[PDB]
Structure formats: structure tokens, C-alpha cells
Design an enzyme around this catalytic site. Structure first.
Site, PDB file in Angstrom:
ATOM      1  N   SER D 237       2.943  -7.206 -12.065  1.00  0.00           N
ATOM      2  CA  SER D 237       3.203  -6.267 -13.191  1.00  0.00           C
ATOM      3  C   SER D 237       2.414  -6.283 -14.377  1.00  0.00           C
ATOM      4  O   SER D 237       1.282  -5.988 -14.364  1.00  0.00           O
ATOM      5  CB  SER D 237       4.586  -6.414 -13.696  1.00  0.00           C
ATOM      6  OG  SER D 237       4.991  -5.116 -14.211  1.00  0.00           O
ATOM      7  N   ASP D 248     -12.602  -5.241 -12.632  1.00  0.00           N
ATOM      8  CA  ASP D 248     -13.092  -3.986 -12.419  1.00  0.00           C
ATOM      9  C   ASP D 248     -14.230  -3.433 -13.299  1.00  0.00           C
ATOM     10  O   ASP D 248     -15.002  -2.606 -13.166  1.00  0.00           O
ATOM     11  CB  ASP D 248     -11.866  -2.834 -12.474  1.00  0.00           C
ATOM     12  CG  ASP D 248     -10.842  -2.948 -11.204  1.00  0.00           C
ATOM     13  OD1 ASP D 248     -10.073  -3.714 -11.580  1.00  0.00           O
ATOM     14  OD2 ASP D 248     -11.158  -2.494 -10.207  1.00  0.00           O
ATOM     15  N   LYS D 262       3.451  -5.340  -8.186  1.00  0.00           N
ATOM     16  CA  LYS D 262       4.834  -4.585  -8.894  1.00  0.00           C
ATOM     17  C   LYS D 262       4.221  -3.961 -10.114  1.00  0.00           C
ATOM     18  O   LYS D 262       4.385  -4.236 -11.028  1.00  0.00           O
ATOM     19  CB  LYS D 262       5.708  -5.872  -9.496  1.00  0.00           C
ATOM     20  CG  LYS D 262       7.051  -5.198  -9.919  1.00  0.00           C
ATOM     21  CD  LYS D 262       8.124  -6.484  -9.691  1.00  0.00           C
ATOM     22  CE  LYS D 262       7.614  -7.604 -10.660  1.00  0.00           C
ATOM     23  NZ  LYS D 262       7.891  -7.311 -11.912  1.00  0.00           N
TER      24      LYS D 262
END
Lengths: 332, 344, 332, 332, 333, 320
Positions: D237, D248, D262
């Protein structure tokens, strides 16, 4: 009068010794003894064998050992490995003999079983054996692989062509492990491809004359190309020449075991027809200002033990080259 | 003088060497090189026994296959705690490389003020790594000489582990105490040698005629020789003598007077061939040296040092059943007693 | 009148027993109730068999045990060794019977199938097994090893010619284990080659008549030839009556563990019309003044119970015999 | 006339079932079935429960698994580790219930003894257990290792001042292990430190209106500072936002085990005039474009386990950090 | 009659939900989620093969799919799977959220198909993965006959008329039911052994008084005195405890084995579309004692945990009980 | 005299034998050699595998806590060779003043060496079941009344697990009285010899109060012939279920003939007969089913016995 010790010793030993010896026998047994007790390695060459002049052999701390065996010899197929402490060959003690005797007893007439006994550390009893440049493109990995087992001639162009295959690669793997070394000139020429500024090496002794040095040029096509070098205890001379040229210029991360520091220049010069000598003339000094001899070159990362997954150290080198590729992609 | 054939080399090595070293140092190096090619137990140095003459740990060092070796641990010394055994090649002492020196240097380093710990690194036959032994020094000294009787038999077994203090009288009285024994087991194990006079006196008992030991060099002058007289009281007494690697020099002239004259039966393991004598003498005005000038031999004519005493019966290990060597020696003694009885 | 007690017992037993018995079967169950009850070696034999006339079983403290098997039959190959307490054979209990019953049970035609169960001390379970004279030199030593296959007839000449063939006068080792024994005349003939003076053994009993005695003659050519006896617990009878004469004459030293005693003589005599009785009538008495029964010979040497090196006891005997040769060489 | 099938089904269930069932129970079961087959995070709350309203519980492959505890809670005394699936709590079957029910069972007064049985991979049988923000300098190198355990306010300024205290670090090792994170705003603030431009995270649904977007502005003081963040299954999460911002955008090195996906947010809303359901109307988005949900952040280097040598994860991360520092040194 | 409470949910979640859905999708999802959750053995057949064209039984042990009994003919028994093992995956799909019908349909297929199934056995920490591809025997050295039943319908009533009327030598028969899943009460022809004395053998009860079938027995069974001992284990289910209730309530035998759990239930078919339908458990089997198989099963009187006879202890105890019964019969006779 | 076939032997042994022995000793040896070919005849000793063997120690004696078990052969007593004697000699050696310290060496099957040891009716209600399990300590007098009152205390039990293990046995009259409970008609025992006269026979009367009471009796090697009367009655008249191991069938009974004040001989002038034509000696009462090993699951013997008893009760209830 300081010119008296040797004469008295020679007279006493040629008169009262338990056996009879003449001038020639004491002289030949004193010259070679001085050679052996003077430095790490020395040898007197007889006149008959002076016309022309198995495993690679190198002493460590006085006990003769094999530094890095080669696959082409029958001994590697027999089961010899690096770090093996040689103790006896052909019922003859090895605590005192030169490498020359070893190369005659090892290389010669084939089909001759030679009873070499070697003491290994990992197990008590001495084993007895009756014994008789490369660039690759690894699969499943665009990054190139480099394996060198010696710094022979006609290698710089081969390395250039091999590195021309995959210019897009953001990293190479250098396999200097189990390398006895090679010529200093070949090593610095090979390392020239990965550095551009500064001195590759400095060969200095105690006399300012003939302090040979090698400088970098603008013929390096892979200055910014990431590299990770694999070294281990069994790398020597030119191996640490490359691993000092790189690590001293901060153009690589050295990964592997702590290596063994050795390497010096020696040559033959006939002082007489019946007198030939060998002596450590000068040493190799790396660009940082330190010599190979004293302690070797410590890798930044030390870790002990299709095909990449079979070596943990190679995995760490893969980690390092991938991180370098990450930095290159971040900046670019 | 004819120094030239070595002076060329001294000039070359003092001209084109990595370092700049003194002529004295290279002279010493050439002398040590001559020593390290003539023999294996000679030392040339300036400082010597001029004013040398204490205590020690009772250790013994000997040169085998180029390595110093502890041979005879002693119970009187505190070596029991260290658990030192024979067959341990010497690698390092005081955690520093001791690969190649002379025996005299090891003796000098061992000798010193007592109650001082020492670190010994040695490679044992069955251990994988050179163990470190912490041994503390002491001053208590006690020779080991005793006379005992073997159980349920008139034969006696006595122990003499040294050739000091002229124990010949003690051995004679112990043997004469119970002459009923038609055989007595003598042990040379745990006795790598000692004074040659005590060895001659001990071996004089079992030999009544012929020569005992002959010390000779290449010079005929001073070809010293010992001859046994008729004073030998036990010229008829059979014995069984046990020898092993823990015996050399003095304990090898006895096993040459007996085995070569068939006077005794020799059982055990091949011994250590230390059959030569080392003496100090000067070579220059202020320098003394230690190199042998004569070895000594056996009555058969062979020499001790070249190969060592060879036992007749070879075997390797309630005291009789503890070690198979003593069992075989008792068997030989009993058989000799039976042949004596059969003759009677 | 103690005989009246026999009348009382026989009446109280032949009148009110739970089975029908008569005079014949009360007398037969008392003849064999007294024979094989006096001593374990006594037994009863029938005159029906009298007109007619692989392992060995000896009564070790009553319980039948196996002394020594034979290589000529697969009984030895079945794994039976000394101390094997026989408990059952041919699925019938070996509770209490003479050895003759056992030899009928197994010995006979080689094709006869036999099944024997033995309760050995090493294996708690009762194991079950189904069963259907030379002189040789010793390598590296002047001594020779001599073994006797059996004490049967015409063996003395063979050993005499074997000893005369090789003039080895420094010592010989003698093997006795594995020989069950045999007749006395063969034993004295074999042992007279070594014994020269005195009495080798004396047969004696409670009767002053027929106290047969064998005396050594002065024709022994091997009095001073060194020998070491090789015996164990598996030697009995003829392997200890004459081999005890050695230790009695101080002619050897025995090597091994304490042996066994089987030195009593017995024969058959009729007692009634068609009945025979076997009883040990006399004994063998060694020249020291002691009989073999039943201690054997007291131990001499404490020992753990190409060809020479395979057995420790033979090595100890070789050591003793070499010592004897050393004494001989010193005297010579 | 397409409004008859469900009415027919509910009437049939209410007519010919084993037990008489009220409309309330059948409708509740149908709504609960819709909730369960619709979304895996649903709940059913009534009017009484609406006013009313340590360890981590998450759904993996259907079963409810405990991920990692918090060292602040007494769970460290209980020795709660990872790789645990709650098989029973207080000896009751836990096959299929909502996550909210388990969370409510966990929540309560502190120091409450609660029985919990768990399934661990290494153990053969389930066991029953009872339950009753600093800056560190890496040794030998100027690198630092920082840790965050409390997800409260002013943590951004605390980590900023900690970083500013020792700017000598040419690279700092990071890790998100054992950290599920809380609100997205504080996570955005924490990840803003390493990102100076572009989009950081977003929270979207199929409704275009009310789609939140968070983009880091040009206030990041460590855009050039190398990092190597370590992730494993113990993070999900609100910590995967950072490992999606860095991996990224190539601003750190992500190593370790795969995380838990999650990536969605749960909130409570009323469905009826008296009923309410707890459903996820929004999910997270990575700056690359894909979502965290159901796959999690994928580590670049995957390996599995003085303090550096204890665990291989920190060793490999230190290797990557050292290589990045070498690249930075080579650059300048 | 009224959709209000559910219609609020459908109207909200048709738009407010994260993903786009239609009325048909949510309708089918709600029907399936109500059927599968109302009772563990109820589901809706969306588009199954029975609509168009017209391998073991899996039982939900306390809601989790478990292997009941593999078949010797199928390679399932050769796979080594034992009862009491929780199925977790089949053909790379999790089994935690579907009905038994889907599992049995996936199991059935073309021959030589290596369908993979992962089952978490209790005896092993890790789940093994296997790629799955009545007769009477004269036991050795025993006058008794061994009866092995592969389907429950085969044991109701035929043998008195034709079966055992030709071999009166059977003074004792081993009756085994271990691993039997169940069967019908009225459909079999071959070798149908029977031992029930008389009276009510099983009953049915529920909410609908109609069709409450209660099969009865009369005095047409002369085998009321033939001694029997019954072998049961955890692998017996449904009707396998119908018989073990009939016998143990008539005191016609003693039950020997391990405490078992059954699955006695009745489901029917009610059309909801052109050809397919849904199922629901509405009635259950009841034993003549006044109880029902569910739950906790029926406890054997003798509980013992696990040349053919000598190979198993439980059969060795059942043969002991059979011999004791023969002894009683001989004493009275 | 007519003992010529023994006078010849005694003359040969007094003439041509190694030693000279008094005639009285030879006569005693002759008596003992006759007594040892017609017949093989605290602690218990019996003839197995050719030697005396211990069967089971009494619970009251220290041998109970001394660890004496079955499968033990007698090798030595007091560190002397005891290969072959009569049973009476060992009986007299053990018998005497109690609490006598004496060392016994016994061959152990599960030990490498024979060890040395220095030797110095209740009714239980089985829980959850109406059945009860009982035991018998000794077969001495006035035991039948206690057993009868214990059984009559709780007659509700449709099955009783009879324990014959640990009870060596006793006189025939006590065995007949205690087995009369489970048999109401027919012959119980017959003590006969080759003489028809003095063939004592016992027959059960109608006093039996438990003719229909099912029972499972467990017998093993620990039950001797003196207690096998019950197991010969029940197992042959179908009045109980016999489970366990094969028993110790030393059936026949001897009588004592004194030869001196403290010396006597014994001959088996009496034999036992079961009420089926059988005899206890020497096979013993073979159990119907054979097994080899919260008070029930600890052993397999009582488990199988309880199983058979429960089946008996089920058949009884099915009859009712």
C-alpha cells in the site's frame, strides 16, 4: 680488515669439514646459497643449459605452491587447484629447489607418471597424483562477458573487436580470476581501453635510469562504459596491474576475494661464460603510488563462495553493473 | 686469495639490486647460503657462547624433512597441560613465521626467564589445522629413573629416559638387586639422546668384548674409539629393548651394540637418525661458529646418522595390554627365558 | 541293605505308574539312567550295532557344543565356529543324548539333508543352518609353517620327510588349532621327532595294571630347532597330550588362549547278553604330573583371541621364534 | 418483463428450504453474496453498527495471512513473524470471513490475552500463540542507513534535517520492509524528497471527475543523491508509492522480495436509508501508468536470506550503493 | 415480491463501483453469491454442458473442498491421494470459491488428459501436485466371504431371491463400507446383498410433508440371524451411514472402524431458464433411532485406528467379532 | 534278588571305573537316574527348553518389584552351575523363611548377558460401560464365596472380562468351584490314571448363577495348568471367549513318597482331563484368537477381549 671473514670460513670448511671439498665445490655451493638467501627467487644457470636460456608455479612465504593451474595441462584434469601447497615430487623434497627443476620434471617425455605429492589445507593428508584473449557474448544477457587467462600478444585488437559486438551494452564482466598474470605492457595496453587520462602504471626501482612508464592516450573507446571486475586470491602481477589501473582511476568496482600481491621484473645477463644469475631488478607500482608486492589490492566488495546463477560473486557483479546501467539511464 | 668468482656476483648484486644493502649484510647472506647447502644443522653468527655461561620447558627440537619437530615431551615439565605429542612439525612460534632457521636459534628462544607463556603452532598428523598451544614455563626439574618388577614373573622392567648425571651406578645396582630375572625389558622410547659417556657406560654392561662406539671424520687423527672391558657383569643377561622415533644419538649407540652383536632383541618403530655431534669453535677474531667435524658409528661399521636405527620387530600401538609394543617385547623376553631354561 | 531301596523304588514305580511298564523297560530305563549319568562321556550301546562295527560335538559342561568343523564338508562353510551350543537338530531337541546319536543324525552320506539350530552367545536368536599334512615355506623368513590335517595313520612319515626336505635349522612354527585329535600312537610318532629324553606322557588310572607309558628315544633330530606352539580353545585330546609334553620339557612356548581338555580314554564292554557299556576307564597324565582334564594347559602368553600378516597370533609367534633364532645365533 | 427471475428465485428459496426463512435473512444473504463475489474488501454494516464505527491482516490466495508486526506493540514478545496464515483464532474456524471482522477482533484493549493459531511453512503442524525514526551511520563508509517506523506528522522535516546533518553520504541504503504505510499524503511528502519533477502518485476510478493527482514540485534536495531501497512482502500500500516513484523514474535501486499489491483504498458509505457498505471506490496509480494492485512493486534484483553479513539483502544493497558511489566519483 | 433493499445496491453499484458493469452481470453475480452462500451445496448452472449436449467426488469438509474417495479404475487412486486432504487448486485455478459441479466438470474430459490438482495433505508441510491422467472374493484360509461395495444402491435387496440362495455355505460374511461415498436407495440389479431384519430402515423429513418418503421393510428377509461385522471409516458418507444406522438401530450388527462423517442430503432441480436450473439441499435422511446423519456422524462401537486378513488390524478385530457371534450361535444351538 | 541287570552295572562301576565310590552314593545316583527318564519332572519354575524357567512373580513378594518377567531360563543360582536338576530341588531352595536374601542369575532374551537379581479378588467397574473387569490373586480356599458376592454385587453387567494372567492356579477343588459359576450341567474335570479305580471326577450342579452371563477370558503363558481348569471348561462348553497366548500345560499331578525325614521322591500317578476328551498336558488350552502385546487402550489383549465382549453383548441385546 673487513676482507677476512669469507677467506677464513672457506679455509676452515675446505680443511676440517667431515668431507673433502675443493675451491670449485665451495664456490658453487656459496653462489647459489647467496642467490637463494638474497631475495624471493634467484637461480644460477649452468653454461651447458645457458645456450637455450605443467602447472605454473610460484612461491608464497617461502613454501612453493601453484598459483593458478590451466585446463590445458593434465594436472588440472588430475585434480590440482589454486592454493595447493606443494611438498614433495618424485621422492624429492620440495622445500629447497628452483622452479626450473619443476618445469623439467613436469614438462618433457609424455606417458611418464610423476608421483607428485601436494598438501592441501582443507584436508590433512597429502594427496598423491600420478600425473602424465577470449571474448564471449553470453546468452540470455545482452551484456558482454570477458575471460582472460593470460596477457598474451595480439589481444588488444581481439578485445576491441569483441567489445565492438555489443556497443549498446551498459556493462561488462571481467574474469581475471585464477590468472598468473602476464606482460606489463600487454596489461597496460589492454587497460588503456577503459581509461583515458593519467598514467597506466609506473615501473620504478632505486636507480632513476630505465624507470619505464606507460601513459594513457585518446584511443580509448570505452571510457564511460560500465565494468565490474572479478578477482580472487589466485590473481597475480598483470591481473593486479589491470585491477590497479581501473580501481585507481575510479573507473570500476572490484568484486571478489582479496588477491595475492606479487610481480617484479627480472632478466638474464651473462656476466661470464660459466656464470649466470637472476635477480629482482625492479617492481611494478600502480598509479595510486603503491606497489603490488606488499599486500595486494583489496576489492571494494568481498564475498567468498544457465551459468550466471551458479556463482554468488558473479551475481554481485551483475548487481553492480545493473546499478551502473541505472545511473547511466538516470543521467541520460 | 681467489675471491673473484664470488666477488663478481657480490659486485653485480650490489650494483643492480632493488635495495641498497651493506657489504656486511650480503657477506652474511652468502655465508648463510653456504651453510644452507653444506648441511642442515650449522649456524654462523657473530654473537656466540663467549659469555653465555637458567631453565626451560623441557622441549626438544630436531630437523626432519626440513622442519623442526618436537619429539620428547616430559612429564616433569608443565607440558602435560599443553598436551604436546610427537610428530608435530614446527610452523610458527610466538605467532610469527618460523619456517626456516637452525636448531640453536629455537633452543635460544626457548631458553629464558621461566613463568613466561609461549605460543606454539604445529601441524599434527591427524589434525586439520596447526593448533595453538599455550604453555607456561616452570623451574621444577626431575629426572625419570626407576626400577620395577614385572607382575607374576621374576622378570623386571626398569625405566631410564636420559643420559645425565652418570646414572650408570643406579642402573647397575637396580639390575644387581634382583639377578633372578633371566630377562629385563629396557626402554629407549622417550629418550632422544644424551651424554655419550653415560650411553657407553650403559651399553658396557651388555657387551664384554669388542668396540662400542667409534667417532671418526675424514681425518685419521683423533679417530676416537671406545672399547668395552671385562667389567661387564650382565654379559649373560638377556634383555628386550624397545626403540621408536623418540630415540636418537646416545640412545642409538646402545641399539647398535646390542642388535648388531645379537646380544638383545630390538622391537618398536624406526628411530630418528641423529647420529652426529656438534661443537663450537672460532672461525675469525671475534666470530664463533657451530659446524660438525666428525660423526660416530656402530660396531657393525654402519653409521647412526645416515638412516637411523632399525628395529628387528616392527609394530605400532595392565600396562602390557595397554600398548602392543610392550606386549610383543614381553613375549620376546619370555621366549628368551625359555631358551635359557631349555639350555640349563 | 541299600539294594532293598532299589526294590522299593522299582515296585512303587512299576506298579502305580500312569503308563504300562514291565521288567524289560524298567531295566533299560535304569541302565541308560546310570550310563550317561556317571560322566557326560559314558553311554550305552546295543550288541545289534556291535556286530555292525560332519561337525564334532563335545560336551562342554554338559551342554553339547561344537569343537571344530571340517573343510571337507559344507558344515564348516555353514559358519559354525567354536563355542556353538547345539540346542536342536532335525527339528528335535538336543536335550540329553550321547554324541553317537548326533553323528547318526548328521554324519553319513553327503547327500543326507541336515538341519541344526545353535544358540551362540554373540547372536541372541538361535541361528539355524541347513547342511547337505604338508610343509610350506614362509616368505622372507628362514622358518617354515607346518599344519596337520588329521591325526590319522601314516602322518608321521610325511611330516618327517617334509622337515628333512628343507634343512632350515633356525626355527619352525607349528599350528595345532582346528585338529580335533586322534589316536595316541600317531601323536607320539609325530611328537617323537621333537622330543629326545624323558617321558612324553603317561597313561594312568586307579589300576596299577596296563598303565601304558611312552618313553622318548635318543633319535630326535630336532631337539634344538626353535618352535612356538600355536593353540587356542579349539584344541583337545591328541593336540594337547603331546603338545603339553613340549611345555613340560621346556621345548617351546605356547601362543594363544587357554585350550580344552579331551584326554580321557574309553572303550566298550558287554554287560549282559545283548548289551554294551562305554565308560571312561583311564586318563592321560602329562609328564609334569598333572592331567589334561579339564583345564587344558594354563596360559603362557596373553593375546587377543602375504599370509603371515593376516593374523596377530601368528605374528606374536613369529616374534617369539625370531627371538629364539637370535639366542641361537648369539650362542653359535 | 425482465424483472421476474430474482423474485422467482427468492420466493422459491423462501418456500421449499429446510428451514423457514424470513425475508430479512434471505435478502441479507443475497446482498452478502453480491458483496463477496463483487469485491474482496466488502462489509455489511447496519444502523446500530454505523454509529459505533497491532497486527496486520491481508488476503493472499484466498486465505487470510498476517504479514508483519510492529515492534512497538507487544507482538515482539509473542514472536510474530512473516509467512503466517491465520488458521484459527480462539479455536474457531476462520475459513471465510471479511477482513474487517478480523480487524475488529484484533482491535480492542491493549494487553488482552488472545489465542491465535497460525500455519507456518517450515512447521509441519499449526501452532497456537498468545498475544499480551532514527538515523544510523554505516560503518567504515560515509554512507547512511535510515529507518522510518512512525507514519505521523513532521517526519518529513525530521528526515530532511537528518539528511542535511550528514550530507557526506554519496549514497544511502533504504528499505521499506515491515512497513505498510498509512495516508497517501505523508507518503507523497516522504517520496517528494527523492523526486524533483513529474507525477508522483494518483488515485483514480472509472469516474473521471474526482481523480486525484500528486506531482512533486522542484523542492527535492536529493535528486542526485543515490539510493538503494530494499522491498519485500512485508511492505504494501502506502510504502509501494515510494518504490513506484523511484524504480520507475530511475532514482534508486530496488532489491529484495516481491511486495504485496494492496494498492487500493477502503472507505465507508451508506447504501440504504439504514444500511451501509464498506467498498473501495478508488485505487492507486504509479507514475509509470500501471497500478500497484494485485501485483505489487517488482524488485529489480531478487535474492532471499557486521550486521551486513547477517542478511544477504543488505549486503547486495550495500554492493549496489557502493557501485553507484563509484559512478558518482568517476563523474566528478 | 419487493427488490427495494437489493435494488438500492444494484442501482448504486451499477455506476458508483470502480469498474463498469451491466444489469445482467450484477444479477448473475448476486444469484450465484446467494446460492453458494445460503448453503454449502447449492449453486446455479449458468451455461453448463447439460444444456447443450444433453474424476472423484469432492465433499466440503466444513466448507473446504476435500477428497472423499478416489476410484481404483481412474488414475486418481494411483496418484496416492488419501481422504481428508484439502484441495487448493485445479488446472492453475484456485478452488476456494467455486461449487463441486465446476470441479467435477473440470475433472471429466478427454482420456489421456493430465489434469493437475494441488491438495494440501496434513501429513506433509507442502502440497503435493499430481497430474491425474460389488464383488465377493474368497479370502484365503477362511470360510467367510469378503464383500466389497463400489456403490450403495447395490446393497438394498436382491440376494435372498437369487443371490445367496445357491451358496448356503456362507455362515459369516465380512461387510465393508470403507471409502463408500453413497448411492440411491432403490436402483440396482446385480448381486444385491441384504441383511435388514424388518421395520423402518430410513426416513425423510423437512418442511414439506408431501413426498416425505420413508422406506419400510417387512418379514421377507430370512437372513436376520446371519452374523455380520461392519467395517467403516472416515471415507463413508451419506447412505453409508444410512445402513450403519439401520443396522446399529436394529442391533443387527456391531460397527467396527473409525468415527466417520457423512453427507446425507437431498437436492432437486428447478428450471430458471429454457433448459438449465438450480439446486438446493431441502431434505435430509433420518435414521430409525430418531436422529439424522448430520452432524458428527454415527460413532462405531469399536474404534481402532489403522493372507489378506493379517495385513490390517481393524479387519482382524472385525473377524474376531464375527467369530464371537459364531460362538454365541453355536452355544445357543 | 532279580536286579541282575543293575547289579552288573554296579559291579562294573565299582570295578573298572576311574574312581572308587561308596555303594550308598551309587544307589542314590541310581534312584536319581531312574527318576529322570520316565518323567521330565515367591517364584515359579517350570520345564521349558530343557531347563527350569520362571513364569510370573507374585505381586506381594519382592520378586514383583525385582523386574522378573517371562521368557527367562534358569542358568545359575548363587553363582553355581545349575544345568540340570529336579524341580523339587529348586522349590526347596527357594522355599523356607521369607525375606531371605539370595542371588539368582536368569537368562534374558533381550539382554546380551544373563543378569543377577538379589531377591530378598477385586472387581473393577469399567468406566462408561456397564461391563466390569475382575481379577483373581490366588486359588486357595474360601475364594468362591468372595467371587460370588463380588459378582452378585453388580449383576447389571452383560459381560465380565476374566483375568487369568498373574494367577498360577491351585487345587482342583477350588478350580472346580470357581468354574462352576459359568457351567450348570455336565462334567467339569476328570483326574485319571491307567488304573480305572480312583478316577476322581467332578460334575457341575445347578447352583450356577451366571449360565447366560457372557464373559471373555484372557489366558497366556502366565497361567499354569492349575488354573486352566476354567479355560478348559468354558472354551469347550462354549461359555466364554478365550483370547491371548498359549498357556503352560503342566497338567498332571504327582504324589510324594518319603524316603527319609526330609528327602522324598515324586511320581505322576494322576493326570488331568478336560470335559472334551482332551488333557492339559502339555499343549495347554489354545486360545481361539492369538495376539501379542483409560486402562484398556494401553494393551491389545484387553482391547480385543473388550471387543469380543461387546459383540457378545450386542448379540444378547439383539436376542432380547
Amino acid at each position: 680488515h673487513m676482507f677476512s671473514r669469507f677467506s677464513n670460513v672457506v679455509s676452515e670448511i675446505e680443511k676440517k669439514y667431515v668431507d673433502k671439498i675443493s675451491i670449485s665445490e665451495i664456490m658453487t655451493k656459496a653462489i647459489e646459497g647467496l642467490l637463494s638467501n638474497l631475495d624471493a627467487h634467484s637461480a644460477y644457470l649452468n653454461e651447458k643449459k645457458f645456450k637455450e636460456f605443467g602447472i605454473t608455479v610460484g612461491m608464497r612465504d617461502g613454501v612453493l605452491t601453484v598459483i593458478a593451474p590451466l585446463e590445458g595441462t593434465p594436472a588440472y584434469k588430475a585434480g590440482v587447484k589454486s592454493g595447493d601447497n606443494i611438498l614433495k615430487i618424485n621422492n624429492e623434497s620440495t622445500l629447497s629447489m628452483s622452479i626450473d627443476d619443476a618445469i623439467n620434471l613436469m614438462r618433457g617425455k609424455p606417458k611418464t607418471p610423476i608421483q607428485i605429492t601436494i598438501v592441501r589445507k582443507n584436508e590433512p593428508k597429502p594427496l598423491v597424483f600420478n600425473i602424465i584473449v577470449y571474448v564471449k557474448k553470453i546468452k540470455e544477457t545482452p551484456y558482454l562477458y570477458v575471460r582472460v587467462s593470460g596477457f598474451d600478444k595480439n589481444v588488444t585488437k581481439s578485445v576491441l573487436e569483441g567489445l565492438k559486438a555489443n556497443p549498446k551494452a551498459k556493462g561488462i564482466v571481467l574474469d581475471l580470476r585464477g590468472n598468473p598474470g602476464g606482460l606489463l605492457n600487454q596489461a597496460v595496453g589492454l587497460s588503456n581501453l577503459f581509461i583515458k587520462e593519467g598514467v597506466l602504471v609506473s615501473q620504478k626501482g632505486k636507480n632513476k635510469e630505465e624507470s619505464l612508464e606507460y601513459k594513457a592516450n585518446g584511443r580509448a573507446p570505452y571510457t564511460n562504459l560500465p565494468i565490474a571486475v572479478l578477482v580472487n586470491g589466485g590473481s597475480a602481477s598483470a591481473s593486479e596491474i589491470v585491477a590497479g589501473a581501473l580501481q585507481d582511476h575510479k573507473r570500476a568496482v572490484i568484486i571478489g576475494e582479496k588477491t595475492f600481491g606479487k610481480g617484479s621484473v627480472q632478466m638474464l645477463l651473462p656476466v661470464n661464460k660459466d656464470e649466470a644469475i637472476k635477480i629482482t631488478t625492479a617492481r611494478y607500482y600502480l598509479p595510486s603510488g603503491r606497489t603490488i608486492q606488499a599486500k595486494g589490492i583489496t576489492p571494494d566488495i568481498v564475498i567468498y563462495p544457465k551459468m550466471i546463477n551458479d556463482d554468488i560473486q558473479l551475481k554481485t557483479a551483475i548487481d553492480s553493473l545493473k546499478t551502473w546501467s541505472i545511473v547511466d539511464e538516470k543521467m541520460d
